[PDB]
Symmetry: D2
Subunit: 363 residues, 4 copies
C-alpha cells in the first residue's frame, strides 16, 4: 500500500500530548455529556424540571467543585449546549474546566439509527458536516471528542454487519477528528443486557475490538492520538452466576490484552449501570490485575460520579456544597482506583446491588 | 447466518414496480438535479444570472416539453428546490412530471468529502437524518433517489479504502431508501480523467462493481428494487489510443456481465462529459452488443440531454419552444438508442470532433 | 487496483470454449468421481465386493453406454484411479469419453478438514502441488476439474469464518486450474441436512454465493472459464412442510439471479440426495421458471444418474445391458429437463432407491 | 457471534508455557531449518558437497556447542530431515537439544507459490495433511513450528490480495498447530529487496501486521500460545540513504506497538541478510528503545548465527572447535542483545563477509 500521511509530525505531537494529559496517572474523565432529553430523566428523579437554567446550574455544581478534584479530572465530556454556557462568575464553562487543569471534550454523535435486516441492531449517525463542527469546537476550547456505538449480545447479535458497520463508522469519525486537531474517544459499547455469562461477554468484546482496530488501521488512524472507551467485561444483568471482581478484572484485562495495541494511549472505562462503589471497586481490581497492562486503565464515568451529587442536590440551591462534596468524594475514590490503590476488601458481600437474578426467584 | 426480513412482500413489490416503470423499454432518465452551485456554472455560460426564477424557468422549460417526450422519459431526478416549485399554470413540478407518465426522483446526497491518508480521494456524506428526509420526500411525490460516489483512476487510485468506504456508504443509503418505499439509484462514478487506456478503466470498473454488490448483499439490499448508474467503460480523456464505439460497448457490457447480478432491474448510464451525439451513439452500440444483457441498458443523462436546450434558450423567454425542441430531439434519440434502434442516416456512428490527444501534438 | 493479466486472450478463449462445450444445449455432466471410500458403500449396497476390477467394470458400464447418451453428456467427472484405467478394448477411459463427444473432468480436492473453534464446520484441502497435478491431468486428457466445499445450516452455521474460508479456498483452486488450462467447477455445497425451511435455505444460499463471487473477483478469476455447481434451494430433509416443485424452482432461480453474474457460463446442479425422478422434475421446473436466466441451468448428477444402473447391475456380468439402459434413460430424461422439455412421468409402485435398515428381516 | 472453544484450559496452559520457555529472558532461537536446496548453497560457498552426512555433521556442530550456549538458546528450528538424525553418540538430535534446555521446533511449510494476476507475488502452501504431520512431529519431540510467508515492497506490492491471502494462510496454519499442542511461529516476512526507504517499510509493516492479527482473530487463534517472527523495519537493500540503528529501532518498535497485541508472548526477529554484527546491534538498539514494549523482543536467527561458524569450519572436521566457538560467540552476543546489554567494538568485526549483489552470477 502507499503512504500519503494523514498527519504531519506536528499534528501527531499535538494529538498525543492531548491524549496523554487526559489519562495522566491518577486522572479520569467526567462524562457530563447527557443530551437534554437524557438529563431530563435524571432531573425528574429528583423532582426538578428540565429547564436550561437547572441544566446550567447542575453542570455548574460539578464543574466548579473545589480544587481537590483538580488532580482527579483529566477531562470533561460536554454536551453541545453546555459548551456555550457560562458559570455565575461570568466565565464560559470550557474556561472553568481549563483553569482547573482539565481538558474539554465534546460529544459529536447524533444518536443511533436501526440497521434494516437485523434483530434490533443499530449504527450511529453524525458524520455529515462533522469536519466543520470539529473545527468550530476546536476553536471554542474543545480538544477531544466522543462518539458512541451500541452493540447488543443476544442469540443472533452482534451480527457480522453490525460489527463491521459500527467499526467502520467509528473509524470515519476518528479520522475527521484527527484532521481537526481533536482527540477521538472510540466508544464501542457492548450492552450488559441479557442473561449471558462472563465468558460470552469476553468473547464478544474480543471479536468487536479486533474489528474496531482493523478498521482504524484501514482508515489510517493515529492510535497514539486516540483513547478507547469500552465496557468492562461483566456477566449479563440477568446472569444467575456469581463472580468476584477479580474475575471481572481478569476477563476485562485479558480481552484488552488480546486486542488493543499498546500504542493506544489509554482506555477510559464506562461504568454502564454500575453503582458508584461497584464502579470504583471494579476499576481498582482491574488496575490490581497482575497482568501486564501497557495502557492507562482509567474512568470516563457519568452516573458513577454523579449519582450521590444529584441526589444530595435535589433542586435545592441550599445543598450546593454538600452535593459537590459527594462528587468530590467519588472523584477521589476513582482517582485512587485508576492507580490500584483504592481500599476495600473487593467488597460485594453485604453492600447490595439487586442480585435478584441470582436468588431463588430467578428460578 | 439469520434472516430478519428488512422488507415485506408488499414493500418489495412496490420497489420492484417503481424500478421497472422507470426503465421500461425505450425509457430513460432526465437528470436535472443540479444544485445552485452547479446550475450557476450552467446559467453563467449563457449569460443568465443565477436566480431562483431563472432556475425554475429553465426546469419548467424541460419538464413541460410536449408529449413527444412522454414515451422517452421514465423518470426525472430533481434537486430539493425544484421538488417544491410550481409551473406557471400553478401545478407543482412533481405533478407535471407524473401527468406526463414519469416517476419523480430526488438527489439525497450532501456531496463528497475527503478521505484523509489518500491521494485526494473522497467518500460521500448525507446519511444523517436520511430516513426522515426520505419519508418526507415520499409523501411529497418522489419514488426514487440518487446518491453519487466519485472515484478516480490514477497511480495509486482507487485505493482499497476508497473502494470499501464508497461501497459501504452506497449500501447504507440504499438500505434507508428501501425502508421508506424509495428506489435507490446506486451511482459509483469512476471519473474519466487521466491517460489510462480502455482496459485500465474496464479493470477498475469490474473491481469497483464487485465491491459494490458485495456491500449491497452485506447490507441486505433488495436488488430488484434498485438501479445502477455507472460510467460507461471508456479510455481516459488523455489516452493516445483510438477506439471505436463497438470497443467501448464490448468493454462496458463485459464489465457489467462479470459483476452485476441479473436481479438488478436496470443500468442507467451517466454521460460523464460525452457530447450529446456521442452519448447516444455509445449507448446505441451498448444495446447492439451481441452479448446477452439481462438488464435494461438505458440513460440517466444531464448535459447529454440539456446542452442544446440551454444554448438554444439563451435566457430569452422568446426562445422557449426552440430550446424545448432541442431537448425533445435528444430524448427521442436516446429513446431509440436504449433499444439499439438509433441508426443516423447512413447507418453509422459519428467520429471524434477533435481528439487532440491522439494526434502528433500528444507526443 | 492494478492489472497484471493472469491469462492471455488465447488462454481465455480455450477456457471459454471448454466451459461452453460442457453445458451446450441439452447436455449435462455425469459425476462419477466417487473415491475408493465412497464407491465402496455403493458396491456394498448391491452385495458386490469393492475391488479395482469391479470399480473399473462399473465405470466402463457407464462410459460405454450406447450412442443415445452422446448428446446428453457434455462431460464426465472422474476420480484419479479411473482416469488411468482402460476399457476392455485397450483404450484409455479418457479416450472413450472423448470419442463419444464428452469432455473429461477430474476431481482434485483432498476432502474436508475441521475448522477449529466452529460448531463442526469444515474447509477443504488439496491446494498443495495442485498446479503440478493440474498440468499433468491436462496432459492426460482432463479439461475441467471439480472441488467440493461443504457448508451446513444450523442455528450458528454457517459462520462468517466458514463462509469466508471456503470462498477463499474455492478461489485459490479456481486460479490454479485456469493457469493450467483447466476449467474449474466451483462447488460450494450447502448440505440439505436439518429441519430448516425453504426461506432459510434461500437466505443462506444467497449469502454464500455472494461471498463466493466476491472471492473469485479478489483472486482475478476468469468467470467465463468457470462453471458453478450449487445445491438447488430446497427445505431441509427433516423439514415437515411439503413444498411444490414450482416453489423450489422459484427459490432456486431467484437466489441465483441475485448472486451469479451473467458471465458465468453455466450452473450444473448437484442432486444432493434427491431421488432420480425428483432431481429431473426439479431441474425441469427450474428451466420452466418464467424469470430470466442468463446462464445454462443443467445437471452434474452422481447418484441421480446411477441409482438404477447400479441396482439393475447387482454385480452380475449378464446384467450389463440392463444397467446401461437404466443409465441411458436417466441421461435422456435430464437432457430434456435441462431444456424445460421434461414430461414428468410420475410414479406408482417402485423404481430404485438406496440403503436397507427397516425392511425384510428374513427376506 | 457464538463461542465453540477451539482449546481447553489445559491445552491453552501447555501452549502458553512452551511459548514463554522459548522467549525467556536472555534466550532466542537458532533457525537451522534450511531445506536441502538452501543448505546446499552454504556448503558450496565453502567448498563442501551437499550430502546427508555433511549436513548431519554441520547440524551436529551447531547443536553440540558447549554449555555456555544453553542459557542463550530457548529453541532450535529444524528441517524435517534433521529431526530424525542422530549425533555421533547415538542420541537423536531432539534429545541433544532438550538436554541443553532448548525446545525443538520444526519448519512445516512447503514453500511459496505464485498468485496469478499479481506482480510476481506469492502465497505459501503446506496445509494438506498438516494436522497429521503436526501430530507426528509433536510425538517425535517438537513443541513449536514455523511457517514462512513472503511479501515484497514495490510499486503495486504488496497488493490487497497478497496481504489478505498470506494473512489467511498463516491463520489456518496457526489453528492446526494449536489443535496438536504445537506453538506456531507466525512469520510474515517483508523482503528487504528494493530501494524503498525506512518510512515505506514501516508503513507496509504496519498494514501487513494489522491484517495478520485480524486474520488470527477471525480464525480463533490463542495469541498467548503464539510467537511472531517479523522483519525489522529497515530501508531496502538498494536504498542509498544512511540510517542509524536508533532510527531502525524506533521504526521497528513503533510499528509493533501499533499492531501487535500485548497478549502475544514474543517477537523473534529474523535477520534478513543483515551481517552477524549488524543483527546484534539492531536487536540491542531495539531493546534500548525508550518506548514501552510489552513483549519479549529477541532473535530467531539463521545466517546471523551461522556465518562465521560456517567459514571457520570450511568442511574440515579439524576446524570443528574453531567453528563451534564462532557460533557460541554470536549466540552470547545476541543473548545480551535481546536484553539490551550488548556493546560493540566500533566497526564491522567478523560479520559482513558476504554482502549485497545484483545479478553478479546466479550462485
Amino acid at each position: 500500500p502507499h503512504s500519503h500521511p494523514a498527519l504531519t509530525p506536528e499534528q501527531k505531537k499535538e494529538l498525543s500530548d492531548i491524549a496523554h494529559r487526559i489519562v495522566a496517572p491518577g486522572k479520569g474523565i467526567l462524562a457530563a455529556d447527557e443530551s437534554t432529553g437524557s438529563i431530563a430523566k435524571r432531573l425528574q428523579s429528583i423532582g426538578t424540571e428540565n429547564t436550561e437554567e437547572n441544566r446550567r446550574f447542575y453542570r455548574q455544581l460539578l464543574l466548579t467543585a473545589d480544587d481537590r478534584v483538580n488532580p482527579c479530572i483529566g477531562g470533561v465530556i460536554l454536551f453541545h449546549e453546555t459548551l456555550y454556557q457560562k458559570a455565575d462568575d461570568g466565565r464560559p464553562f470550557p474556561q472553568v474546566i481549563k483553569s482547573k487543569g482539565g481538558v474539554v471534550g465534546i460529544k459529536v454523535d447524533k444518536g443511533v439509527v436501526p440497521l434494516a435486516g437485523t434483530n434490533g441492531e443499530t449504527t450511529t449517525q453524525g458524520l455529515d458536516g462533522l469536519s466543520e463542527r470539529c473545527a468550530q469546537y476546536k476553536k471554542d476550547g474543545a480538544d477531544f471528542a466522543k462518539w458512541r456505538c451500541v452493540l447488543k449480545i443476544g442469540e443472533h447479535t452482534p451480527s457480522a454487519l453490525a460489527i463491521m458497520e459500527n467499526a467502520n463508522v467509528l473509524a470515519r469519525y476518528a479520522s475527521i477528528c484527527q484532521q481537526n486537531g481533536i482527540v477521538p474517544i472510540v466508544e464501542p459499547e457492548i450492552l450488559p443486557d441479557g442473561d449471558h455469562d462472563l465468558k460470552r461477554c469476553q468473547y464478544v468484546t474480543e471479536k468487536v475490538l479486533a474489528a474496531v482496530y482493523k478498521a482504524l488501521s484501514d482508515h489510517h488512524i493515529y492510535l497514539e492520538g486516540t483513547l478507547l472507551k469500552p465496557n468492562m467485561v461483566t456477566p449479563g444483568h440477568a446472569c444467575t452466576q456469581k463472580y468476584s471482581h477479580e474475575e471481572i478484572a481478569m476477563a476485562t484485562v485479558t480481552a484488552l490484552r488480546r486486542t488493543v495495541p499498546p500504542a493506544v494511549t489509554g482506555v477510559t472505562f464506562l461504568s454502564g449501570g454500575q453503582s458508584e462503589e461497584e464502579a470504583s471497586i471494579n476499576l481498582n481490581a482491574i488496575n490490581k490485575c497482575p497482568l501486564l497492562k501497557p495502557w492507562a486503565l482509567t474512568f470516563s464515568y457519568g452516573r458513577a460520579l454523579q449519582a450521590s451529587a444529584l441526589k444530595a442536590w435535589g433542586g435545592k440551591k441550599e445543598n450546593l456544597k454538600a452535593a459537590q462534596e459527594e462528587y468530590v468524594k467519588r472523584a477521589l475514590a476513582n482517582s485512587l482506583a485508576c492507580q490500584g490503590k483504592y481500599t476495600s476488601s473487593g467488597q460485594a458481600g453485604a453492600a447490595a446491588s439487586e442480585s435478584l437474578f441470582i436468588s431463588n426467584h430467578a428460578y
